[model samples]
Target: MVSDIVLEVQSLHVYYGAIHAIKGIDLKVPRGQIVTLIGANGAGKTTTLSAIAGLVRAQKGKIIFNGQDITNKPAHVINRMGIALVPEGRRIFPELTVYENLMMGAYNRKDKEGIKRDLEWIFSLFPRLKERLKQLGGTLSGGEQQMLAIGRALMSRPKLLMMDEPSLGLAPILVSEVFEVIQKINQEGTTILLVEQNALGALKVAHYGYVLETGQIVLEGKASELLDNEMVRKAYLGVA
Candidate 1:
């Protein structure tokens, strides 16, 4: 039903110059679940997320958000509509203090009381962030910076949070830590669209999963089912 789906992409096609990046793909993010798109490098994972967040233009497709046709809307407009993107590389403002960077996420809001409530919620999720609130965003460790990025996004109180490669470049332990936080966030009533090259980790945390290869969805299923599939075990789970 339309009410159960928070985001839907139908036959999405994106291009970069002469290169066809995302080719006629369709996916759905059910409300209040972690739906992950897992793929190898250059398989259009980031591009797909970018298109949904309106950071990249789609040449062909329909993007529906909460029953609204939001295809090709401007990024800020889309953001204000409650879709937040915690982009790859934890793109915090390098020169800005952590507090300032987080406030940037709420720049569009006028609800002072609600903003205060959400800020406290973010602190509860990432207590480390509150400690470094006065520190420059660029000086944090990789894990800290990732937390900051997520905190910044939550400051918007997004209905759907789309994260790109959140586990990329983290240590093995930190990678697992990030996944734990992903699950934590989902449990607290936010729908999530997670794009990850970390197929194993993503599949473990996701309620449902899609496998993307070279711009198309090759396979999709409940996360536990995909985790046990022989093909997925061999190709993505690193099992022989």
Candidate 2:
């Protein structure tokens, strides 16, 4: 609840009807830094994020954002309150132009100056997007789509941005570029909780990381130490 901690999850659990997708998991996102969640395919990484965003219900426990208990709040309320989700596979409006997609991210806000400022900021971050402003989102390359997704999310001017699997299907080089953008965003003061499969890349940019296995956190630490740990290096980082 303090300024240093932007988000906190207390023994959170999530379910998909009969399936308990997320076990009791605890998490935290410090202000102005990148915190990554790296886990396996069935590890419920997305489920934990979904619960925080109110996209799915948390079967148990609390989600506190800026000291407010938002455990069961609706998704729209969560978005309006400054949490944006850049979901898996870059969900952009295919029919809309790149410019329109960015506009969509600011649909909830009315502050022209703020929106204008963020637009310029986003363009500076993704110069490629500025060039393709008129192009349909569906026509953009995968990496372009990824940039578009991040840009769109920033339009919301969120305090906490939760990104799920950002490096999915990207070319090796694009993957590196995406992480760089993530670091830039954090530097600009957006707290981020990232869920990524690329452990090596995630750990490299993140300030801290949580290792999720079977819907629970098995380990947590500073990113540098996690990268150097024997078990993690062998199981995830080195093999990554």
Candidate 3:
């Protein structure tokens, strides 16, 4: 049976002040699965995610989400369309409490009862956030902040949750914990598009994987297949 695709990128090209960042890349994220884009810095992984999130403009290309072409849509519009991005660096409101930061994520919604239900779900997912609901966001640990970032995005009730470099700056143990949460989230029915430099960790949780290099996709396959590729093993998995 053919799988349902949640997102599709065709010949995507992006530029940053004349520097071509994404060079005609094609990608797909199927519904109900975790897909990962793995690469070194400057490989256009983040650029791809940003474009999908409408955080950056694509000079030429098509980004289709759930069969709708949204290439030129604004970030807020994209968010309203059910795509939520947990951007790099965990950009939470520093002065706000954890609960307040999450509450802000639902600012676009008018259904108070639905928002409350989702808030309870998010709190259940990250019990630590509930424990620190009164603590300022600036005072949370990196792992906690990352969880809060994800929880904040979840508060928006996204259909596809796009996470960028979630494992960056996290401890080894915390990295595993984060990936575990990602897997759990996926199991609970959220389609995931994970962009990360930690290829090994990403492959462990992803069903499909793409390896980007120098602004283009160099490899693409099932995560298990990519894990067995010699070049992927050597360059990304550190298995040389």
Candidate 4:
């Protein structure tokens, strides 16, 4: 099962006290593809991503990433295994400088030269971050802060990146740019598992997609097929 996919969650179940957040959900992210999970707020989309990152415990199931079973591993251990998650909120340290924040992403690594190379690569991806190197993280605008968050995640040199609600609060133009950057990252040999509310935009960038509803995947298919699905059109894409 893990041999063919970069990431897989089989019969995944996650509970929050008495509430079942995820129920026997199965997901597969192919290598070097932008695969997205789209759903409303309570559909367990974030919970799925969090569990894969080892941020949340899987009550019952297995999470295999990069050909390894990582269900019970620690969060840092999972990150070291090349899976980086840009959480729902841009969780950068407000008091830290942009450069400082980026440095934090590489804290688990000891390869100084490689870290330096990654830093330069990140700067190339987010040039605005380069200009705001010495500025406080909290002072940057929403789009810039989002860039910093993505840059920080990239500094970890992850092979699989999971992003949650990346376009949540951005303007339309900024949202377009963010999706473009996400695709660029995928083109650069990173597999992306994105959870986004912008259904149309997410489908545009994704090669495959899953529609999660009320803690279960109700539909799964190629991005274009899901985009054209009549139910999806009315519910998520806002089409008549």
Best prediction by TM-score: 2
lDDT of 2 by residue, 1-240 (tens): 456788999999888877888789888899998999998888898888889999899879999999889998999899888999999988888899999999989988889799999999999899999999999999999889989999999998988999999989999999999999999999998899999989999999999999999888999999999999888888886655
Candidate 4 yields a Cα-based lDDT of 0.90
lDDT by residue (tens digit), candidate 3, 71-160: 979988888888989989988888999989998888788887999888888877889889999999989998999999998888777789
lDDT score at residue 227, model 4, on the 0-100 scale:
86
Q: Evaluate model 3: give its lDDT.
A: 0.91
Worst 10 residues of 4 by lDDT: 1-10
**Tens-digit lDDT track of model 1 for 161-188:** 9999999999998898899999989999
Cα RMSD of all models vs. native, in order, equals 1.6, 1.5, 2.2, 1.8
Q: Write the per-residue lDDT of candidate 4 for residues 1-49, one digit (tens) a residue.
A: 3355899999999998778999999999989899999999889898898
Candidates' lDDT values, in order? 0.91, 0.91, 0.91, 0.90
Model 3 misplacement above 4 A: 1-3
Candidate 1 regions off by >4 Å? none
Output the lDDT of residue 106, model 4: 87
Q: Itemize residue pairs with steric clashes in candidate 4.
A: none
Instruction: Report the C-alpha displacement of residue 112, candidate 4, in angstroms.
Output: 5.2
Could you tell me how far off, in angstroms, the CA of residue 165 lies in candidate 4 after the best superposition?
A: 0.5
